[PDB]
């Protein structure tokens, strides 16, 4: 279909393989499916952050808003690693 609205397959696939044993194969179907799951992750997290900005009459989704939304939707295991990453980015 249209791959304009998805993250590129070559980046997603290469990310899948590093998680997997070297002998692993991945169907072209799974690559495509994982492409859609990860793109839905962005929308899901963005929806929540956008809702909170909307409640607070703020017009910008900041980094904190994404982290706050990840915790709200149950991805708190990601949030501390992400903070550390974000500091290495700001320094």
């Amino acid at each position: 279909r249209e791959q304009d609205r998805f993250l590129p397959i070559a980046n997603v696939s290469r990310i899948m393989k590093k998680a997997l044993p070297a002998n692993a194969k991945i169907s072209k179907d799974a690559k495509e499916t994982m492409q859609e799951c990860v793109s839905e992750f962005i929308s899901f997290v963005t929806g929540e952050a956008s809702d909170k900005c909307q409640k607070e009459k703020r017009k910008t989704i900041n980094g904190d808003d994404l982290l706050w939304a990840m915790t709200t939707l149950g991805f708190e295991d990601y949030v501390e690693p992400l903070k550390v990453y974000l500091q290495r980015f700001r320094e």
Partner: protein
């Protein structure tokens, strides 16, 4: 970055309510998306090894989704 920030922004912007986006937000997502892809592929692979197959297939991803709560939002994207 592993994934392109411009595409990430693109995805964020399909949401009608999104206005401006801090430049840190695609950066947070690039890393966060990685972690998501790693964790979902690993849980999918548990099913692949369970069936003692060597190919990760779509049905493995479908399986991983039902087995963990934080992934409910994905049950319509990959049913079965």
């Amino acid at each position: 970055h592993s994934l392109p920030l411009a595409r990430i922004k693109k995805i964020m912007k399909a949401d009608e309510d999104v206005r401006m986006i801090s430049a840190e937000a695609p950066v947070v997502f690039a890393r966060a998306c990685e972690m998501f892809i790693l964790e979902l592929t690993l849980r999918s692979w548990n099913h692949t090894e369970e069936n003692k197959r060597r190919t990760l297939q779509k049905n493995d991803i479908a399986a991983a989704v039902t087995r963990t709560d934080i992934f409910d939002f994905l049950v319509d994207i990959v049913p079965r």
